Design a protein around this motif. Structure first.
Motif, mmCIF file in Angstrom:
data_model
loop_
_atom_site.group_PDB
_atom_site.id
_atom_site.type_symbol
_atom_site.label_atom_id
_atom_site.label_comp_id
_atom_site.label_asym_id
_atom_site.label_seq_id
_atom_site.Cartn_x
_atom_site.Cartn_y
_atom_site.Cartn_z
ATOM 1 N N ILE A 1 62.378 46.984 2.419
ATOM 2 C CA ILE A 1 61.834 46.724 1.089
ATOM 3 C C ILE A 1 62.794 47.204 0.012
ATOM 4 C CG2 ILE A 1 59.476 46.745 1.922
ATOM 5 C CD1 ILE A 1 59.221 49.630 1.085
ATOM 6 N N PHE A 2 63.453 48.338 0.250
ATOM 7 C CA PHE A 2 64.361 48.880 -0.751
ATOM 8 C C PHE A 2 65.504 47.913 -1.024
ATOM 9 C CE2 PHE A 2 62.605 52.121 2.063
ATOM 10 C CZ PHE A 2 61.864 52.885 1.187
ATOM 11 N N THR A 3 65.858 47.092 -0.038
ATOM 12 C CA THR A 3 66.850 46.042 -0.215
ATOM 13 C C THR A 3 66.146 44.745 -0.597
ATOM 14 O OG1 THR A 3 66.879 45.168 2.048
ATOM 15 C CG2 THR A 3 68.123 47.186 1.625
ATOM 16 N N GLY A 4 66.653 44.077 -1.626
ATOM 17 C CA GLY A 4 66.096 42.821 -2.077
ATOM 18 C C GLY A 4 66.190 42.694 -3.583
ATOM 19 N N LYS A 5 65.537 41.659 -4.105
ATOM 20 C CA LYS A 5 65.586 41.377 -5.534
ATOM 21 C C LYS A 5 64.807 42.431 -6.310
ATOM 22 C CE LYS A 5 63.877 38.056 -8.965
ATOM 23 N NZ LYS A 5 63.114 36.794 -9.164
ATOM 24 N N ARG A 6 65.414 42.932 -7.381
ATOM 25 C CA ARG A 6 64.811 43.919 -8.263
ATOM 26 C C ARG A 6 64.581 43.321 -9.647
ATOM 27 N NH1 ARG A 6 66.979 47.381 -12.381
ATOM 28 N NH2 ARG A 6 69.088 46.717 -12.967
ATOM 29 N N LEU A 7 63.746 43.998 -10.430
ATOM 30 C CA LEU A 7 63.599 43.645 -11.835
ATOM 31 C C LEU A 7 64.776 44.199 -12.627
ATOM 32 C CD1 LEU A 7 59.787 44.433 -12.298
ATOM 33 C CD2 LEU A 7 60.874 42.375 -11.371
ATOM 34 N N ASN A 8 65.445 43.325 -13.377
ATOM 35 C CA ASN A 8 66.654 43.681 -14.106
ATOM 36 C C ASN A 8 66.390 43.940 -15.586
ATOM 37 O OD1 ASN A 8 68.116 43.410 -11.735
ATOM 38 N ND2 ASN A 8 68.710 41.287 -12.161
ATOM 39 N N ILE A 9 65.128 44.132 -15.972
ATOM 40 C CA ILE A 9 64.816 44.384 -17.377
ATOM 41 C C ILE A 9 65.491 45.667 -17.845
ATOM 42 C CG2 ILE A 9 62.965 45.017 -18.971
ATOM 43 C CD1 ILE A 9 61.228 42.903 -17.795
ATOM 44 N N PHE A 10 65.262 46.764 -17.131
ATOM 45 C CA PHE A 10 65.820 48.059 -17.498
ATOM 46 C C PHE A 10 67.184 48.226 -16.840
ATOM 47 C CE2 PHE A 10 61.173 48.866 -17.716
ATOM 48 C CZ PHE A 10 61.100 49.109 -19.071
ATOM 49 N N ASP A 11 68.202 48.485 -17.654
ATOM 50 C CA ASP A 11 69.547 48.676 -17.138
ATOM 51 C C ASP A 11 69.637 49.965 -16.328
ATOM 52 O OD1 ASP A 11 70.164 46.368 -18.442
ATOM 53 O OD2 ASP A 11 71.379 47.299 -20.015
ATOM 54 N N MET A 12 70.563 49.978 -15.373
ATOM 55 C CA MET A 12 70.748 51.149 -14.528
ATOM 56 C C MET A 12 71.461 52.249 -15.304
ATOM 57 S SD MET A 12 71.852 49.265 -10.967
ATOM 58 C CE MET A 12 73.522 49.020 -11.561
ATOM 59 N N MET A 13 70.974 53.477 -15.159
ATOM 60 C CA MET A 13 71.553 54.644 -15.809
ATOM 61 C C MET A 13 72.101 55.572 -14.734
ATOM 62 S SD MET A 13 70.667 53.332 -18.577
ATOM 63 C CE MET A 13 69.383 52.513 -19.525
ATOM 64 N N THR B 1 71.535 61.646 -16.149
ATOM 65 C CA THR B 1 70.809 62.068 -17.340
ATOM 66 C C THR B 1 71.336 63.417 -17.811
ATOM 67 O OG1 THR B 1 69.057 63.210 -16.111
ATOM 68 C CG2 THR B 1 68.764 60.853 -16.520
#
Lengths: 581, 435, 74, 109
Positions: free
Chosen positions: D76-88, D91
């Protein structure tokens, strides 16, 4: 939508073969929302199961279980035929029938009152050579109890001892049913005592069978007694149990007690779908009057009065051919409580989908009395139905019905329906002229003109215009002609018709400008033609505009500007040159 | 300065009464102080917090102090709007919160992370629409969150998963996309995140299967991960994970879930009492069913009574496991423990024990022990506390006791049971008479 | 061209025109009546003579036809 | 069973001959108490949920090898993700202890 993202990759690859579970939800969700699985919807899932081809024992089991009491819209016999058909189809697809599959079939048979020899089904199991289980034997006892055969039931129970199977509450509930169904109330009461003697406190299901038993005989006094006992006892109160008692009284033919039992119904957490199912079943049983009582006792949607908890009732009444008076009476009551702003119209829709003119007419006439504005669009789908039927007299009766209501078919009515249906347009008008029904047959003659113009038979267009004595509209021809040109285009034709025109021109006088508007006709045509289409019409356009120069009937200057602008957009020099000439 | 004290003491009524008096006098109240008053009022919904001594429905009321004070505010900064939106969502004023957010946007004021998290719940609860619509609405808020340069926290994603529980059929794959988004961004899924997922992937109450296999991937990830409290729902994971292990009937998976509970300080996430009992009930019930009796008895000694007190049904499951294992010499012990755990007068348990002891004939030594336990179970039936209402002797119990006395050789005691049968109107089986 | 959605089956293109005529001169009202059934899919296109008409048709949030609120989109 | 099949035929014949109900009163004492009556233990509690459980209650307990298929190699961790929020990447956190914790933050803690 760009292939709907390949239907989300053919619906995420059909949930990786779990679409069947996904489909189980759509089924379950329908039962949560409505309590009923639309016959259509089930056909889709089933058809999708055949489409998928890969069936699962549990998945095939679900479909069989769906054919039981979960189809309140269908008659008991239709459910069985459906179930039989599914069972056969499932077998043709290679469904390995285990004990569960045959057990579910027994439940469907029992739920749908499908009368069968318990020996025959046991023989079917023996042909399969699959060992039956307790549920099978218990359900076979219920089969013998549903027919009131206590001896047979006891004999299967005698074998049950040899197999050492535990007696469940379902067995005792089935026993009560048998003695009740046989009319031996005393014996049915003995089951209640024997159960208490064995230490198995009677359950609400057993009491529902007891409640149902009394309803069959119409012993309301005993119904009240056992009710009060249930109320006093710890036994919770389910309206699915009560709502079932009304069905028993309704099925038993004592709707006077239904009102009493219905008054006992207290709106609870979520029994709308159960009452929704009961109402559907009552209309199936042709007990709409009781269904109306229950329908009025249901709570109106808090947000909007015009809720559809009467729509499922009205639609199934239409499907069941409920008497027009009955159906209209129900609509009126729904309209009064605002349960439906347009109850009759909705019924007219489904009744129109059923393709019944007699009902449509009566319903449509009831729409006028209700005060909603009648439109030909109401008769339009019905005319389509008869067009497919190809009934010359049938469609004539629609026109007569429209006259009774006062609707008159315009040109659009003919072009869309009456014109295609009849084999010959001219013969249609002749038959329609024989009746004398049409206010004006010119609209029909003009209707055929539209079709021939749209088809691109511009030669017919011109010849038609001449022969006809009544006036025709030129602007409408222009818009229909430019469509026809896209369909059929021939340079020679336009010249031939023009020579034919010179021969025997009629009317002669035209309000449309002799030349200025002829330009407008050409301008509109050019605008309609797509750039690519006008590019293809390069050689012929030049000749046509050279014919325009020799005729000297130049187009208007203001319209000229319009055309030239259209030709600049096409970016073709030959076209621009044609304008200069 | 004197008003600030009442706000720190959480005197909702005194603060409002004093704030009004302060405003009537005309003295200036700092925006920060007014913001603190709104925070106190918005959080508690203008209701006094429970003190030592002096559910259904929307708690937000139109004629509330927060609304009146909010309008009175001469200057309203971003925080004042944020706390007001959060208060409305907390108190089920979803439509009113969304309307206030629209006003917030009209003022060109950036909302904080916490406001955005509350707004997600509002859109789902406020209106009733197909998942496609609600998903588009949620996605639209996420797009607004990015436009305003607002970074999503862990709660932002956990609320989405919790909100997506309603739309079980349609949110499964979308929910995975949300989880996959968390991993890419860097927000580490806490136990609450997985709790929501495993719940989401096993919502249907119909006999379904193979949908719960989601758990296997989660367990591999969580293997040997020491967790810290991140979300208020972190304590609900283990109970949900163990319930799925029972449904799937996978004992190896149950040991992996339990193993995770024992690593480091993970045992502290079991949760309240009713959570712990449910977890252990589902866990122990699976052991008896799917494990050897020799190991089941070890788990029985370790868990009970130190970990939990068994439900009467779990004792029946243990008796059934002993039967399957053909280890009926322990049945007398189970009765003794059953009485110590408050199951002396459980009819179901007493009937099960007697039936198993009398089902088949046993050697003289085992038959004697069963007679003593039967005599003890008989004494419990005689001294029932239900006697105050009605004393019932189930036919089966009476018969089993009589047979066990006959087989052990206590004919004197068995002869007395014959009077009870006719007394209680209990029909003796042929086996009792034949013997 | 204004894109109308959620149009009741009772409402035809003519009715759309008269309701949308108050906002702008409708050049052409295209209501695609589903074939055979004769009832549109619940969507339609209204071409206004000027863009102002299209804008005016989008300003109003409540477009009620036959008592059914239709959804209008640019 | 086949012997039971023969019995079945005798059941129908006997019933046809009886026409009326037999004098099989006392119900054979549940065929001499039959065998097991533990089924009550599920219904002695008699909860509303339990009725729904027994209303839908049938032999669903035995699933046996319900899902033998497994190991589709789907993580499940591999696959299509939502790209709305950019990766950071990481912090940077400033303590800001002086900032008074808002009641909501205190209650959340």
């Amino acid at each position: 939508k760009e292939k709907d993202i390949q239907e989300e990759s053919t619906f995420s690859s059909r949930k990786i073969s779990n679409q069947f579970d996904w489909a189980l939800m759509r089924l379950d969700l329908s039962v949560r929302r409505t309590g009923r699985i639309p016959k259509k919807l089930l056909q889709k899932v089933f058809n999708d199961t055949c489409r998928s081809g890969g069936l699962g024992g549990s998945h095939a089991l679900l479909l069989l279980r769906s054919c039981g009491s979960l189809l309140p819209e269908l008659k008991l016999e239709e459910r069985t035929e459906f179930a039989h058909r599914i069972w056969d189809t499932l077998q043709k697809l290679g469904a390995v029938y285990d004990v569960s599959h045959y057990n579910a079939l027994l439940k469907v048979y029992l739920q749908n009152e499908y009368k069968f020899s318990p020996t025959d089904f046991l023989a079917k199991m023996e042909e399969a050579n699959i060992q039956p289980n307790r549920v099978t034997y218990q359900r076979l006892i219920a089969s013998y109890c549903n027919v009131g055969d206590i001896e047979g039931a006891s004999k299967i129970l005698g074998f049950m001892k040899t197999k050492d199977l535990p007696v469940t509450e379902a067995v005792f509930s089935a026993l009560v049913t048998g003695h009740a169904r046989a009319g031996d109330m005393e014996n049915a009461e003995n089951i209640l005592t024997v159960m208490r003697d064995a230490g198995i406190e009677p359950g609400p299901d057993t009491y529902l069978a007891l409640l149902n038993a009394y309803a069959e005989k119409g012993d309301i006094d005993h119904v009240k007694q056992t009710l009060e006992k249930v109320e006093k006892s710890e036994l919770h109160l389910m309206d699915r149990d009560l709502l079932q008692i009304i069905f028993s009284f309704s099925k038993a033919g004592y709707p006077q007690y239904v009102s009493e039992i219905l008054e006992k119904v207290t709106c609870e957490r979520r029994y709308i779908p159960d009452a929704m199912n009961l109402i559907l079943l009552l209309v199936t049983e042709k007990l709409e009057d009781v269904a109306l009582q229950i329908l009025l006792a249901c709570p109106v949607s808090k947000e909007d009065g015009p809720s559809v908890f009467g729509s499922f009732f009205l639609q199934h009444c239409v499907t069941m051919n409920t008497p027009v008076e009955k159906l209209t009476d129900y609509c009126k009551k729904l309209k009064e409580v605002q349960m439906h702003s347009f109850p009759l119209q909705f019924t007219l829709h489904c009744a129109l989908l059923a393709n019944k003119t007699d009902l449509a007419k009566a319903l449509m006439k009831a729409v006028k009395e209700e005060g909603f504005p009648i439109r030909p669009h109401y008769f339009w789908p019905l005319l389509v139905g008869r067009r497919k039927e190809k009934n010359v007299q049938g469609i004539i009766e629609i026109l007569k019905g429209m006259q009774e209501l006062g609707v008159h078919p315009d040109q659009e009515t003919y072009t869309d329906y009456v014109i295609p249906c009849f084999d010959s347009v001219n013969s249609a008008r002749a038959i329609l002229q024989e009746n004398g029904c049409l206010s004006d047959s010119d609209m029909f003659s003009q209707a055929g003109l539209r079709s021939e113009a749209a088809n691109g038979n511009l030669d017919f267009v011109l010849s038609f215009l001449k022969s006809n004595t009544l006036p025709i509209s030129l602007q409408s021809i222009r818009s229909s002609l430019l469509l026809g040109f896209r369909r059929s285009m021939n340079i020679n034709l336009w010249s031939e018709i023009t020579e034919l025109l010179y021969k025997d021109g009629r009317y002669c006088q035209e309000p449309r400008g002799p030349t200025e508007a002829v330009g407008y006709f050409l301008y509109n045509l050019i605008d309609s033609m797509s750039d690519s289409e006008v590019q293809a019409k390069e050689e012929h356009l030049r000749q046509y505009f050279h014919q325009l120069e020799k005729m000297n009937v130049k187009i208007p200057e203001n319209i000229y500007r319009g055309i030239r602008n259209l030709l600049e957009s096409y970016h073709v020099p030959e076209l621009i040159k044609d304008a200069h000439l | 300065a004197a008003l600030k004290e009442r706000i720190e003491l959480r005197k909702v009524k005194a603060s409002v009464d004093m704030f009004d008096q302060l405003l009537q006098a005309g003295t200036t109240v700092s925006l920060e102080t007014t913001n603190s008053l709104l925070d106190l009022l918005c959080y508690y919904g203008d209701q006094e917090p429970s003190t030592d001594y002096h559910q259904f429905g929307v708690t937000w009321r139109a004629k509330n102090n927060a609304e009146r004070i909010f309008s009175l505010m001469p200057e309203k900064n971003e925080h004042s709007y944020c706390t007001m939106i959060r208060g409305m969502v907390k108190h089920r004023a979803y439509e009113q919160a969304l309307n206030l957010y629209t006003e917030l946007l009209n003022n060109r004021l950036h909302a904080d992370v916490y406001t955005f998290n509350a707004l997600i719940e509002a859109t789902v609860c406020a209106i009733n629409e197909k998942f496609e619509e609600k998903w588009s609405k949620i996605l639209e808020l996420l797009r607004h969150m990015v436009a305003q340069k607002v970074k999503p926290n862990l709660q932002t994603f956990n609320t989405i998963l919790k909100c997506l529980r309603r739309f079980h059929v349609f949110a499964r794959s979308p929910a995975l996309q949300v989880l996959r988004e968390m991993k890419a961004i860097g927000i580490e899924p806490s136990l609450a995140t997985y709790h929501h997922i495993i719940r989401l992937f096993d919502q249907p109450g119909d006999p379904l299967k193979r949908s719960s296999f989601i758990i296997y991937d989660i367990m591999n990830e969580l293997m040997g991960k020491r967790f810290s409290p991140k979300d208020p729902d972190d304590d609900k994971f283990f109970q949900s994970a163990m319930s799925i292990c029972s449904s799937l009937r996978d004992l190896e998976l149950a040991y992996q879930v339990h193993g995770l509970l024992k690593t480091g300080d993970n045992w502290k996430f079991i949760g309240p009492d009713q959570h712990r009992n449910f977890y252990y009930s589902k866990f122990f019930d699976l052991i008896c069913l799917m494990e050897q009796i020799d190991v089941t008895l070890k788990w029985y000694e370790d868990l009970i009574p130190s970990a939990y007190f068994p439900h009467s049904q779990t004792m029946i499951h243990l008796l059934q496991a002993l039967d399957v294992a053909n280890r009926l010499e322990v049945i007398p012990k189970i009765w003794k423990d059953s009485k110590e755990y408050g199951h002396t007068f459980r009819s179901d348990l007493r009937e099960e024990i007697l039936m198993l002891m009398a089902r088949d004939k046993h050697p003289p030594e085992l038959q004697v022990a069963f007679a003593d336990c039967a005599a003890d179970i008989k004494s419990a039936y005689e001294s029932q506390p239900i006697r105050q209402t009605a004393q019932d002797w189930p036919a089966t119990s009476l018969n089993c006791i009589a047979i066990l006395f006959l087989r052990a050789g206590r004919t004197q005691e068995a002869w007395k049971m014959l009077g009870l049968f006719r007394k209680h109107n209990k029909i003796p089986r042929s086996e009792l008479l034949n013997e | 061209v204004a894109f109308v959605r959620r149009i009741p089956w009772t409402a035809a293109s003519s009715q759309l025109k008269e309701h949308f005529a108050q906002f702008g001169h409708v050049r052409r009202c295209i209501l695609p009546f589903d074939k055979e059934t004769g009832f549109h899919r619940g969507l339609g296109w209204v071409q206004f003579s000027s863009e102002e008409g299209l804008r005016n048709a989008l300003q109003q949030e409540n477009h009620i036809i036959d008592g059914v609120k239709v959804q209008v989109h640019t | 069973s086949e012997l039971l099949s023969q019995l079945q035929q005798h059941e129908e014949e006997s019933r046809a001959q009886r026409d009326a109900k037999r004098p099989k009163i006392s119900f054979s004492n549940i065929i001499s108490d039959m065998k097991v009556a533990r089924s009550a233990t599920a219904r002695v509690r008699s909860r509303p949920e339990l009725r729904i459980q027994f209303d839908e209650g049938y032999d669903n307990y035995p699933g046996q090898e319900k899902t033998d298929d497994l190991k589709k190699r789907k993580n499940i961790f591999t696959g299509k993700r939502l790209n709305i929020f950019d990766m950071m990447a990481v912090t940077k956190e400033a303590p800001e202890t002086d900032t008074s914790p808002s009641l909501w933050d205190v209650e959340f803690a």
